Ligand binder design. Sequence first.
Ligand SMILES: *[C@@H]1O[C@H](CO)[C@@H](O)[C@H](O)[C@H]1NC(C)=O
Lengths: 437, 49
Amino acid sequence: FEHATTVPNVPGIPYKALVERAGYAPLNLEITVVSSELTPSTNKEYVTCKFHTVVPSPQVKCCGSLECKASSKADYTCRVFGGVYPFMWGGAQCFCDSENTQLSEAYVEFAPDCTIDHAVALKVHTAALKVGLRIVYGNTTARLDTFVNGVTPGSSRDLKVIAGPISAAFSPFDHKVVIRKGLVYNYDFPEYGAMNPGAFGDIQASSLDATDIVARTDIRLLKPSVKNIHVPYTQAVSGYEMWKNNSGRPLQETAPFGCKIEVEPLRATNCAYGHIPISIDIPDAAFVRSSESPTILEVSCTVADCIYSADFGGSLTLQYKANREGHCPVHSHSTTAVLKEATTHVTATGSITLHFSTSSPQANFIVSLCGKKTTCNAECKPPADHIIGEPHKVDQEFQAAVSKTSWNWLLALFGGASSLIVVGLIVLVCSSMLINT
Amino acid sequence: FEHATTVPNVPGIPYKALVERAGYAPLNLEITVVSSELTPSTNKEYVTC
Ligand SMILES: *[C@@H]1O[C@H](CO)[C@@H](O)[C@H](O)[C@H]1NC(C)=O
């Protein structure tokens, strides 16, 4: 049987319902999401790390001109110096006094320690929500992993489940993300090839082992001044360490909606947001005939010491006049109160205690012991514990968040004002009819 | 649950209260005052004979 209903996406917090398929008995249905994996689609532009700036030996040649060539190496910088006369140890290196040519060559390379301390840059496109569902119907359980889009039921060995599109589309990732060492940051890195010096993305490559490495660090080769052979060069500071110095907090600690983000693959787990429209196809095997299911005649309610906390704060004694021994479900129709127990064992003329979690100051709700309806009506005290360590099982709806006596006084004032208005219009009508006569 | 309660400070005469949380059964708090020593701050100022 196709049953469609809106359920919370929050992890835990069981959602219970009943199906009424004519004369096939009220059949219970407990569903609860236990995992919520939000996996976006990522493409990789570049990986970056601290660079090394390997500088080869100078090419000095003595009484000649040695203009250099271009190269495909990362951030190749060449300069040619005249009028040099270098000293290595043990004496001079040119037989020429003043006519010499020194070649200074400086490209840049990944550090040997970039196998770990490397950050990849990604763009996420669309968040795909995959949720795992625990279902118990009657006495049959089912673990089903389903995508939340409206199609692809997936695992249908016994049960068919369609997860409709979610009410609110939430994505904890911004359009550009950076992953280093298992930590994700919502950073706006530059495009591939748009390398600026002193900031993130100064050196880029598609992969760590790729020879196609690009960089635009401000490396400048200086004119050699001292007698001894070397290269003088001034470089802009690597923007990778500057980004590490002021990365802010990673997205595992700043993500909204209370969910935690893991890498390989990049996903967000247990994101509690919105409501999932669910559509279940309950098999007819679990359905039983209403003649076999015991019926019920008279049901009375008495709930004592209600408290509208997040816990199951309330005990109701519930009296029945049973027709026949048997186990059969129980359910509270009002969304404001949810029952701990889903199926009781009703035999003959007993009192059943039930635990319910509510959010209204008034406990005025409809409950079905194994069929029919029952109006539980009493009052609920405020919680004494200010902060509880578990989430609320009922969301407020403002239809019952105002207390019964508060509706009484507020509606009494409204009724007084409206009654004065009605008396005013009535006496205007009477006076108009009198002056018309 | 923290239950504030006013008790007379007479020796003997057992005092009785009920503690209760809405999801729990009531329990019989039994409080008795046995001794009450009024020891003040005393300093010796002289001795005579
Ligand atoms: C960068 O590192 C230096 C070195 O100690 C530190 O003083 C500074 O607070 C860090 N952050 C910024 C934004 O300069």
